[PDB]
From Swiss-Prot, chain A:
Belongs to the fungal fatty acid synthetase subunit beta family. [Alpha(6)beta(6)] hexamers of two multifunctional subunits (alpha and beta). Fatty acid synthetase catalyzes the formation of long-chain fatty acids from acetyl-CoA, malonyl-CoA and NADPH. The beta subunit contains domains for: [acyl-carrier-protein] acetyltransferase and malonyltransferase, S-acyl fatty acid synthase thioesterase, enoyl-[acyl-carrier-protein] reductase, and 3-hydroxypalmitoyl-[acyl-carrier-protein] dehydratase. Present with 91800 molecules/cell in log phase SD medium. The gene is FAS1. This is Fatty acid synthase subunit beta.
Length: 142, 130
């Protein structure tokens, strides 16, 4: 680990994850129901720290889209946030992965997708990596 | 460590970050912020000549081409030729500079005043009407 600074003088902890994301190497993981709130996700993003909007409190693509639109409205220009999905419920993935692909096609600031409670198979992970077009893919192995 | 109630996420994460920064500065810099390297912008780095003329061919490697156009020093040119996405009104889209400067046979890019970021100019020329 090292230290770096920008023109504004803000000191960043130069570390591989921080170098990739352009932000400090600290993140708020997807938490049902904590990160479900669009307000908390927007507040963390405005604070300048990675955060995952957890899908656990959303049971429909329309609901998650409304939450994502609320987060986008609440955050500043150029800001970004991730989305967290649980692998144990196939319904969650079936309504979420197409939604993430569609929102990324529209150009939504979905920096990354985190998969918790299970590691996707090689084929599923490849499909996510290719189709979603995210900056990086988070996986929570156990 | 979960003691103080209603501390904003900004305050908590900034406290952790400044703790890490202070400890790193004390240990591997000696409590001197001047030792910290400075870059124009910090981010977008994947985990994996004042006057220059570059030519794109069929077999030219796109990543090497974009690295050469970006240059070594971190600046707006670096961001333009390596940043994968640009920011729309509030949305993220592919980088038009990269899409335009995608290498192909016949493209010649002349970079002038590359050392000076303020005065740096990149001119891409292609065969037009022969």
């Amino acid at each position: 680990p090292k230290l770096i600074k920008n023109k504004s003088g803000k000191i960043f902890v130069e570390t591989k994850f921080s170098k990739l994301i352009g932000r400090p190497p600290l993140l708020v993981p997807g938490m049902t129901p904590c990160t479900v709130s669009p307000d908390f996700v927007a507040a963390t993003t405005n604070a300048g720290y990675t955060i995952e909007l957890a899908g656990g409190g959303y049971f429909s693509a329309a609901g998650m889209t409304a939450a994502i639109d609320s987060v986008v409205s609440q955050i500043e220009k150029g800001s970004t946030f991730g989305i967290n999905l649980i692998y144990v419920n196939p319904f969650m993935l079936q309504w979420g992965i197409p939604l993430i692909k569609e929102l990324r096609s529209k150009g939504y600031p979905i920096q990354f997708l985190t998969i918790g409670a299970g590691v996707p198979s090689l084929e599923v992970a490849s499909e996510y990596i290719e189709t979603l077009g995210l900056k990086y893919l988070g996986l929570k192995p156990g | 460590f979960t003691k103080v109630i209603d501390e904003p996420i900004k305050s908590i994460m900034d406290g952790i970050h400044d703790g890490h920064i202070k400890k790193l500065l004390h240990q591997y810099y000696g409590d001197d912020e001047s030792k910290i390297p400075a870059v124009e912008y910090f981010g977008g780095e994947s985990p994996v000549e004042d006057s220059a003329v570059f030519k794109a061919t069929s077999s030219t490697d796109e990543e090497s081409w974009f690295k050469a156009l970006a240059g070594s020093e971190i600046n707006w040119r670096h961001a333009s030729f390596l940043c994968s996405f640009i920011t729309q009104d509030k949305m993220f889209v592919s980088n038009p500079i990269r899409k335009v400067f995608k290498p192909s046979q016949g493209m010649v890019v002349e970079i002038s005043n590359g050392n000076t970021s303020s005065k740096t100019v990149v001119t891409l020329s292609e065969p037009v009407q022969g």
